[PDB]
Amino acid sequence: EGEVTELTPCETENPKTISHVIIGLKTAKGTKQLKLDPSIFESLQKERVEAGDVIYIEAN
Amino acid sequence: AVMTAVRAWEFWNLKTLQEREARLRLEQEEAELLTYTREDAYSMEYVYE
Amino acid sequence: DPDGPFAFRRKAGCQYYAPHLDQTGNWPWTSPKDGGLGDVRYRYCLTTLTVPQRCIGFARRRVGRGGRVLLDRAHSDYDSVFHHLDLESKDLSQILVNIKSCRWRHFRPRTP
Amino acid sequence: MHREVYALLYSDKKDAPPLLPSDTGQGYRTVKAKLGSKKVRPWKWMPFTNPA
Amino acid sequence: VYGGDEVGALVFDIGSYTVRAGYAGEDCPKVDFPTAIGMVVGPTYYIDTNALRVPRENMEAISPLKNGMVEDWDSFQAILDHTYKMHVKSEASLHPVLMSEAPWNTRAKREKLTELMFEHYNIPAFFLCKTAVLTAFANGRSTGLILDSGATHTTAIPVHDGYVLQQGIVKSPLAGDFITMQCRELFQEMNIELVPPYMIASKEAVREGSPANWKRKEKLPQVTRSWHNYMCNCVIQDFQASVLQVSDSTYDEQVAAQMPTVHYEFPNGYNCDFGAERLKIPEGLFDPSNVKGLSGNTMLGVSHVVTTSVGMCDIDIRPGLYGSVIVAGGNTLIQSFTDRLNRELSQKTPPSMRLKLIANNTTVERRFSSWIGGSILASLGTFQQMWISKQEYEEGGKQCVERKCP
Numbered sequence: 001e002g003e004v005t006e007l008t009p010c011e012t013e014n015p016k017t018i019s020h021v022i023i024g025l026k027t028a029k030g031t032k033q034l035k036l037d038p039s040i041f042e043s044l045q046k047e048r049v050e051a052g053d054v055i056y057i058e059a060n
Numbered sequence: 061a062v063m064t065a066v067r068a069w070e071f072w073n074l075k076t077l078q079e080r081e082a083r084l085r086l087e088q089e090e091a092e093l094l095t096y097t098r099e100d101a102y103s104m105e106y107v108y109e
Numbered sequence: 110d111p112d113g114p115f116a117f118r119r120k121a122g123c124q125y126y127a128p129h130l131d132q133t134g135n136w137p138w139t140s141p142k143d144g145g146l147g148d149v150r151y152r153y154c155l156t157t158l159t160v161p162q163r164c165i166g167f168a169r170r171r172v173g174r175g176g177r178v179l180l181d182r183a184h185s186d187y188d189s190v191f192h193h194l195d196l197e198s199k200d201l202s203q204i205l206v207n208i209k210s211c212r213w214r215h216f217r218p219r220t221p
Numbered sequence: 222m223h224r225e226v227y228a229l230l231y232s233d234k235k236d237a238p239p240l241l242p243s244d245t246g247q248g249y250r251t252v253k254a255k256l257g258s259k260k261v262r263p264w265k266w267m268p269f270t271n272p273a
Numbered sequence: 274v275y276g277g278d279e280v281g282a283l284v285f286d287i288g289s290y291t292v293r294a295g296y297a298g299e300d301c302p303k304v305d306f307p308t309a310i311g312m313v314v315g316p317t318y319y320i321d322t323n324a325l326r327v328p329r330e331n332m333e334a335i336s337p338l339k340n341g342m343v344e345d346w347d348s349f350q351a352i353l354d355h356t357y358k359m360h361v362k363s364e365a366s367l368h369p370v371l372m373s374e375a376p377w378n379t380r381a382k383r384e385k386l387t388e389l390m391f392e393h394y395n396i397p398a399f400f401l402c403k404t405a406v407l408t409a410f411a412n413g414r415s416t417g418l419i420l421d422s423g424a425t426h427t428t429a430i431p432v433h434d435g436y437v438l439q440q441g442i443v444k445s446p447l448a449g450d451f452i453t454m455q456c457r458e459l460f461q462e463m464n465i466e467l468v469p470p471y472m473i474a475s476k477e478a479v480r481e482g483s484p485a486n487w488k489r490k491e492k493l494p495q496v497t498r499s500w501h502n503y504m505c506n507c508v509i510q511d512f513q514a515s516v517l518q519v520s521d522s523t524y525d526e527q528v529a530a531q532m533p534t535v536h537y538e539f540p541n542g543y544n545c546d547f548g549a550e551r552l553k554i555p556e557g558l559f560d561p562s563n564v565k566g567l568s569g570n571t572m573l574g575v576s577h578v579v580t581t582s583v584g585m586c587d588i589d590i591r592p593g594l595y596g597s598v599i600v601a602g603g604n605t606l607i608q609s610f611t612d613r614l615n616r617e618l619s620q621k622t623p624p625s626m627r628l629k630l631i632a633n634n635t636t637v638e639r640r641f642s643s644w645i646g647g648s649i650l651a652s653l654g655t656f657q658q659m660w661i662s663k664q665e666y667e668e669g670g671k672q673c674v675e676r677k678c679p
């Protein structure tokens with residue numbers, strides 16, 4: 001969980017193709033970048049997550 | 061071609077993530093904090109129980 | 110008799126300071142574990158800030174030249190653990206046990 | 222490990238820098254109104270008598 | 274009551290190697306130009322690096338300081354004028370001046386310096402503090418043993434409560450000049466022709482030990498032997514800084530030979546590996562009995578100078594002296610000098626007293642420690658009572674310095 005600071009997709013050549021979705025999360029303790037599975041892009045737009053939005057992501 | 065490209069890409073990704081971790085390590089070797097808020101400096105008293 | 114050459118003889122209206130025997134003396138700005146006076150103005154203790162809400166590690170409040178109150182910081186090998194430390198694996202477990210027993214003085218800011 | 226640290230000038234060459242207090246740390250824009258609402262008091266280069 | 278007050282005072286630290294000057298409150302001297310100045314037969318004076326490094330006919334290289342004390346007051350006035358006009362860019366009568374002085378400065382020289390500063394420069398206030406006291410203050414220590422190894426002398430000065438214990442001062446002639454002489458002798462033994470960089474028009478890369486393939490500058494004017502010697506001393510000091518290293522323990526030929534060599538390239542393109550000879554030279558500071566100069570001499574090693582200086586003080590203060598050893602001076606920057614000194618002192622210090630060397634092994638903290646302490650002292654609000662005012666110099670006369678400045 002944390003405040004979203006970036007939602008930059010990671011473009012790549014397929015062996016536009018994305019291989020990861022980097023989400024930056026900020027908390028009062030600090031900031032962390034997560035190399036999430038690309039499929040999470042559907043849920044991000046479904047939830048309308050934007051920079052400066054507080055979110056939480058369950059591991060499972 | 062897919063069989064060869066998949067392995068070549070997996071290696072490229074391993075290399076790219078290692079370079080990213082190295083860049084993060086370099087960024088963390090740099091000083092993290094140099095300033096703190098005015099409220100913490102004067103508007104509060106530090107206590108311990 | 111053996112002491113006689115340098116024997117101690119109290120005199121009326123006099124007071125004396127006992128010599129250091131158990132531990133060699135040290136400067137006031139040094140820990141009592143190192144024979145120092147351990148003067149509290151030079152002591153560095155774990156400190157937590159309000160922004161960011163993270164423990165910065167060992168720190169001491171010092172007034173600067175223009176009256177600006179500065180937080181000096183001391184390096185420690187466990188600095189990463191102190192960064193992770195808040196709200197009270199082997200080294201982390203020992204540190205947590207020491208803090209929960211309040212063996213370490215860890216300051217937190219509060220409004221007056 | 223050490224419970225507390227003692228030093229005069231600084232503890233070690235690897236010591237982290239001291240944290241100086243400052244406003245505008247979170248950006249100038251957020252503190253624009255606070256800084257703009259006031260005006261600084263005048264400072265002078267003036268002679269002073271030292272009774273010592 | 275509050276933080277120390279800054280009254281815009283100046284801090285001057287005129288050493289035999291470089292003249293350090295600046296404004297009080299700063300953490301570093303704003304200027305440090307070589308003390309040696311060019312003189313043309315008052316005589317025309319060339320003082321700063323920009324003027325010293327260009328050849329001139331019938332220009333001699335001289336220094337106002339002798340044995341750590343000013344001898345030629347004309348060159349001293351010239352250096353002060355140059356410092357003011359070029360670097361300070363402020364009127365002397367507007368800023369108080371705090372100057373350092375040698376621990377062994379004479380009364381008459383102090384009086385003459387005070388007279389000069391007040392009559393000639395018309396300064397508003399003056400103060401004269403010892404280099405050892407300023408070095409101790411720069412480290413936040415009110416007491417301790419200062420160990421200064423400059424260009425002229427290696428001196429240990431015991432300081433207690435901010436006062437120099439003059440009876441405990443022990444001085445040795447082994448200093449930067451001795452190391453320069455040793456390097457000169459080594460180059461002479463190796464038949465290395467010291468070509469100053471001003472004589473080199475162009476140079477070509479050559480193999481190790483190969484004869485130098487360099488072109489001499491044309492239309493070069495005749496230069497005095499003093500200026501040529503000064504340039505040679507400059508290149509030798511560069512060699513000292515770049516190559517020389519103090520052995521971590523008592524010098525051994527086998528251990529020195531086993532360690533890797535260091536390669537140095539001279540200005541004329543000549544290059545060679547200095548092998549173990551780079552280690553033998555700094556050992557003379559620690560074991561002078563082995564120096565080719567005079568084996569039977571009475572000079573004392575730096576560690577012996579340290580132990581002797583403390584031994585002359587009250588035993589009640591020796592715990593403070595050993596508990597705070599402050600190393601200063603440019604000659605102490607030689608590699609591993611601090612480590613070797615610490616080892617030798619720990620071996621020679623009594624186990625009943627704690628020995629601690631302050632970790633100040635950096636060029637700025639070692640060379641400018643006196644200036645740093647002077648800036649600190651001049652910036653203290655409590656120090657504003659110590660200033661010698663012009664009115665005080667008028668009423669108490671030239672002798673007033675004897676009582677106001679301890």
Ligand SMILES: Nc1ncnc2c1ncn2[C@@H]1O[C@H](COP(=O)(O)OP(=O)(O)OP(=O)(O)O)[C@@H](O)[C@H]1O
Nearest residue numbers: 288289290291423424425449510514602603604606
């Ligand atoms: N990094 C270095 N390595 C070796 N020697 C050095 C280094 N830096 C400076 N020196 C030498 O230090 C010597 C003394 O310089 P320093 O600035 O300490 O003298 P000073 O205090 O002005 O003079 P003095 O005490 O002789 O009156 C010089 O001869 C210089 O060549």
Ligand SMILES: [Mg+2]
Nearest residue numbers: 288421423602
């Ligand atoms: Mg010196």
